[PDB]
């Protein structure tokens, strides 16, 4: 008799170990997932890493937005611009279109400061005008002074000065990103204080 064979062992091997499976997006400021300042300092540090890496490769973005960020399962943030997922997140130079090419790193640092503000306060910047006509007025006039009064209590003061300097309307005095790495380092070192 030729039996049945009991051969097996064809492809019962541990084949390629695949990846993927994430937690969620960044549009969670309306979900109200606000936590203690540790998980906010870490997010700011990782996103500053990403922005500084982008600046090193001389890549101009100008389009940093709460929609343009993604959080991953390992508590790592992948800041990749996920297409659509606009208003109030731009820069006066971008809005004016005087040169027809407003692509400059100062726009990146202004957008980063706006992102830091909306991350640390948990509320949209300039959260007092919801009119399409009115919002463009501030950037068109070239003088836009935001307010920082909804800050969460018991937080390090480095972020306050950082967001104050980042959103300033002088293109030759905004803080560069090498400043931001030192700022976030002293920020995480000032957590226990």
């Amino acid at each position: 008799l030729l039996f049945m064979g009991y051969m097996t062992k064809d492809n019962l091997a541990v084949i390629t170990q695949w990846c993927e499976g994430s937690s969620l997006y960044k549009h969670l400021h309306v979900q109200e997932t606000k936590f203690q300042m540790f998980q906010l300092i870490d997010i700011a540090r990782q996103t500053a890493q990403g922005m500084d890496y982008l600046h090193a490769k001389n890549i101009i973005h100008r389009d940093m937005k709460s929609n343009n960020i993604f959080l991953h399962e390992g508590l790592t943030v992948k800041i990749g611009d996920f297409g659509l997922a606009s208003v109030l997140w731009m820069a006066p130079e971008v809005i004016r279109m005087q040169d027809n090419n407003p692509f400059s790193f100062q726009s990146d640092v202004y957008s980063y400061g706006i992102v830091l503000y909306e991350l640390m306060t948990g509320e949209l910047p300039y959260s007092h005008i919801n009119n399409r006509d009115q919002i463009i007025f501030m950037v068109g006039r070239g003088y836009a002074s935001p307010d920082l009064s909804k800050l969460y209590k018991n937080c390090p003061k480095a972020m306050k000065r950082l967001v104050a300097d980042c959103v300033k309307k002088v293109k030759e005095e905004r803080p560069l990103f090498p400043q931001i790495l030192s700022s976030i380092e002293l920020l995480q070192h000032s957590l226990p204080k």
Binding site: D10, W18, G21
Partner: protein, 636 residues
């Protein structure tokens, strides 16, 4: 201030030790180097015969002979090329890093019709990796026969070769040392020649005494020429090659006889110039995705000499099935000629290889039977490419063929789905499951198929990862039918009836939420069932039932986060089913009846069955079904 100009010197003994010892990590490349030198000699003597055939009047043939000899422990490689005079025998074979091949090539620059394999000048001394002492017996057409000899000690001797005369060429005699006698074995020589120099344009012949005569005395020598039997077919123009010749080359490439499915013969010209020839195997290899097989599908050739095989930088992991040859002329090579100096040249090559492979697949998608066979073989690779290769996702997705409701037992393309799709419909309705029949007759697809909408089945586990990244096709998004809130074109009557139903079915829904507060995170009424009472769809964020099954079955997964991205079960009930009508009638009378909660939990468990989930433990469900069958047949 004074300037004392000097000139760079070299320490010859240490330089020779560097070339012998710290220069070639693979000891078997010496044969490749010697055969490349022989090929260069033959190319020289064949190029000189172009102007006048008198240069060839010492033997017509241009051949390479490999002559192992284990009695004296020597390996002789004989060519009939150009040879070299005493002056050349000194200048080229005595001066390290000086190449007569380079000088010969740089001399012409006006009738360039040869591609000569050599520019560095150190390749010959690689013969000292395996040989303790080499003797080079050459004979040019302009000089007498000479006998170069050196033990790599710092000196070489040149004699007049008072012995056996050779007509022309060179005869490198490697007195192999004690350790490296393995290169006299026929199998080892055949393996090395086939691996490294098997597309050399001159017959490479192995000589050994193993053939018997009529049936003893093996004195006769086996003139085994079949070391270089397969000629490089990618050199000829694509118009000049017939299907049969491509098939023969493909069979010779794979060490197994079977025809190929399709062929791609292309070339790019510019700063980076190469000829490629890519083959789609007729059937997928039985170990195609076994990671233990490394990767050797695509082989890189520089001037018809093997350099490196596939790496992740030459061909993506999802195109590891398609095998071929990439031959280039000008590539910046390492000193050992087994890797490129610039490694991103490999990536620029890959950028063309992948584009041409996708063009080959697209052109293969014009005869339905051939592509049906190709898809049955490599649909997994296509979907892996959709998941992994993002820059080609749009083009790769048009190569997807899926079973669907309106096609039957033939797979149909998503573009054809969009063509047949109704104007009112504005999404791609797909169901991911475990088999063809399991999803064909399922709770979620009942209403969609009843209204005539086409549904794309996705049976294989690879489809979960395929649709992780395929979130949109042709501008119309892919929405699962197992996810909650399935948006469907609602007529006025249907939506009015739905509003009335949720205005009528709220009490038992609150009862469901109360009895099932941890298992189920929402109970509602939706119009996706026609003939089933309840199905558990998953919330729009998280893992579906099938995706959760697949990811839970993975052998190597971080089990800590399995509950991090787990499904959110949303049990839903079908208002028109008689079971839910009776249940509502029984729940209106009282909310704490034993029968009500029994039937509700059993409905939830049987919908967990139907929806593709798995229970916490099916023993409880089996025990309750056994108690019910005992009640039915009456044994207490």
């Amino acid at each position: 201030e004074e300037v004392e100009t000097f000139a760079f010197q070299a320490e010859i003994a240490q330089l020779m030790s560097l070339i012998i010892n710290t220069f070639y990590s693979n000891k078997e490349i010496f044969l490749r180097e010697l055969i490349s030198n022989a090929s260069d000699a033959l190319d020289k003597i064949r190029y000189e015969s172009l102007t006048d055939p008198s240069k060839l009047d010492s033997g017509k043939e241009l051949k390479i002979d490999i002559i192992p000899n284990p009695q004296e422990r020597t390996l002789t490689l004989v060519d009939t090329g150009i040879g070299m005079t005493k002056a050349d025998l000194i200048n080229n074979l005595g001066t390290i890093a000086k190449s007569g091949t380079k000088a010969f090539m740089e001399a012409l620059q006006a009738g360039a019709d040869i591609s000569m394999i050599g520019q560095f000048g150190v390749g010959f001394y690689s013969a000292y990796l395996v040989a303790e002492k080499v003797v080079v017996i050459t004979k040019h057409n302009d000089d007498e026969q000479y006998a170069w000899e050196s033990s790599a000690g710092g000196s070489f001797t040149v004699r007049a070769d008072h012995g056996e005369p050779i007509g022309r060429g060179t005869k490198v005699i490697l007195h192999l040392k004690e350790d490296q006698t393995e290169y006299l074995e026929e199998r080892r020589v055949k393996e090395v020649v086939k691996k490294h120099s098997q597309f050399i344009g001159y017959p490479i012949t192995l000589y050994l005494e193993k053939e018997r005569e009529k049936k003893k005395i093996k004195e006769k020598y086996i003139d085994q020429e079949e070391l270089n039997k397969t000629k490089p077919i990618w050199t000829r123009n694509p118009d000049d090659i017939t299907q049969e010749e491509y098939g023969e080359f493909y069979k010779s490439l794979t060490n197994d006889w079977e025809d190929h499915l399709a062929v791609k013969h292309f070339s790019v010209e510019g700063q980076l110039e190469f000829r490629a020839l890519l083959f789609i195997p007729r059937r997928a290899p039985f170990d195609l995705f076994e990671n233990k097989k490394k990767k050797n599908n695509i082989k890189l050739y520089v001037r018809r000499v093997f350099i490196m095989d596939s790496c992740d930088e030459l061909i993506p992991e999802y195109l590891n099935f398609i095998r071929g040859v990439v031959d280039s002329e000008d590539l910046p090579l390492n000193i050992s000629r087994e890797m490129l100096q610039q490694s991103k040249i490999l990536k620029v090559i890959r950028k063309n290889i992948v584009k041409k492979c996708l063009e080959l697949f697209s052109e293969l998608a014009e005869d339905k039977e051939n592509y049906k066979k190709f898809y049955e073989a490599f649909s997994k690779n296509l979907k892996l490419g959709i998941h992994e290769d993002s820059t080609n996702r749009r083009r790769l997705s048009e190569l997807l063929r899926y079973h669907t409701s309106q096609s039957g037992d033939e797979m149909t393309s998503l573009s054809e789905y969009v063509s047949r799709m109704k104007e009112t419909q504005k999404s791609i309705y797909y169901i991911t499951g475990e088999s063809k029949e399991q999803v064909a007759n399922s709770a979620f697809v009942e209403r969609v198929r009843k209204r005539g909408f086409e549904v794309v089945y996705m049976t294989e586990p690879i489809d979960e990862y395929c649709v992780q990244q395929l979130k949109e096709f042709d501008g119309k998004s892919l929405v699962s039918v197992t996810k909650e809130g399935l948006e469907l074109p609602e007529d006025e009557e249907e939506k009015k009836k739905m509003e009335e139903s949720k205005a009528k079915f709220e009490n038992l829904c609150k009862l469901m939420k109360e009895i099932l507060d941890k298992k189920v995170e929402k109970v509602t009424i939706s119009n996706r069932l026609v003939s089933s009472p309840c199905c558990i769809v998953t919330s729009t964020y998280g893992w579906t039932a099938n995706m959760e099954r697949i990811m839970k079955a993975q052998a190597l997964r971080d089990n800590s986060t399995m509950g991090y991205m787990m499904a959110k079960k949303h049990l839903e009930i079908n208002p028109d089913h008689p079971i839910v009508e009776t249940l509502r009638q029984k729940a209106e009378a009282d909310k704490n009846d034993k029968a009500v909660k029994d039937l509700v939990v059993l409905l939830f468990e049987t919908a967990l069955l139907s929806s593709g989930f798995s229970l916490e433990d099916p023993q409880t469900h089996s025990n309750r079904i056994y108690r019910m069958i005992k009640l039915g047949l009456g044994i207490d």
